[PDB]
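Record format v2
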Amino acid sequence: APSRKFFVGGNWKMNGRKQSLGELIGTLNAAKVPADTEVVCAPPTAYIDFARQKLDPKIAVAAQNCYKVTNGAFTGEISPGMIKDCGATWVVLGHSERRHVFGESDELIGQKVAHALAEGLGVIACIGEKLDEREAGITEKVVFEQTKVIADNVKDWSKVVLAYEPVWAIGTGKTATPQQAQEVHEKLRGWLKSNVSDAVAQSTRIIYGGSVTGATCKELASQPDVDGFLVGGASLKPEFVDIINAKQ
Amino acid sequence: APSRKFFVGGNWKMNGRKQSLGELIGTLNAAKVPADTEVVCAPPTAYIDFARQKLDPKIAVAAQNCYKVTNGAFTGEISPGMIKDCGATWVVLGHSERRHVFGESDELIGQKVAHALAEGLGVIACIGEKLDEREAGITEKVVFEQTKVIADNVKDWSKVVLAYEPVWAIGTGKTATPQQAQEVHEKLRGWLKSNVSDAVAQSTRIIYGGSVTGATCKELASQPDVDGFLVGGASLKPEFVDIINAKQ
């Protein structure tokens, strides 16, 4: 469609009960959301439905992970169809904790992307290097290897978002500084041009994942190829509001 | 001889949406449990709220898995508190599909047994040797190893029931006779005495998690040390009511 609609998704990780959640849902349901922005919220999985009942129709509910088949024997899992049945139109996949605390391989994240997309939930597929890789400067290969694999299982880019998360920027104000962010966002929108199509590159949202704070949010959203944000712990605090009102 | 209350929980797995599941909750509620028995249901994480809201309290809701901390940057995870906030009172932990499809390690399961139990939730903890180890003579080792580390994390054994999954028999091609299910309900009981206390062994339920249908349930509830069932797919059906009444 015309110009890349700004995206701010907030991942609440395994934080919160219904009282803290209920109250945060009150702050959000009453913050001014610009039509500038498309906001999605990942609640913890015991509360995707709670959250969807309570939240305003204008904040999309997102699940934090899902599995590869519609229904099966896999205790502890959720499927896309259940995410859809609860009312959440998105799923967060390939997020770093899955990958590096719980070992989700790229072939699992492929298989998930593909299945989620078959069901008609939007994915935020996550990619990003650790410190040993930025050190070796092999950022290029490990963001690009990663995007080959998500991209190989995307069949219709309309529904997917890419979130660059440099692993080190999770959890400390150790952020990729605005130029750091954009070296790699640009290099990756360019990889999508090389390899997919100009219309995918042109229209795909690449959002920034790492430590977005109410401080950092406007300098960051001024890079040409940073399309919005994946907000970790700041989305749980009221400054989240400010991050929705970032690039204008 | 005991006052071991018959336990029989149903693990729904990653199965169902709110139409079907609501329909089974319906059956399940017009059903009548015996006074000697304790029924628990295990919903897909997404529906632990939906299910507790529709189900009769004479049936307890249970989560199918939880993490070892109260709250954290564990995208994908739910914590004992999140479960308890939904009104659910049991976690199924150390289940084979986690331990084998999802790499859950023994140390990490025990750290969740200690922690789910710290939060006042009860725990059905699962153990079982795969085909290879049934055959290699090794049953013993694996099952003992596994109970051991659950036992190194249980302060109060009233809050736990042990479940033998004959993992060697499911999918494989081989099959467990009720008699051969019982001999490992005897070994594990005999482990509880020699290793912890007899005060535990005469008190802890040791429930079977093999193939239990309406047909097999009587021939297996008859065995001495088979205190109940963690039922798979038979549980998504009205047959569960026949399994519940297997001791009548």
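The radius of gyration of chain A is 17 Å.
Chain A touches chain B through 46 residues (CB under 8 Å).
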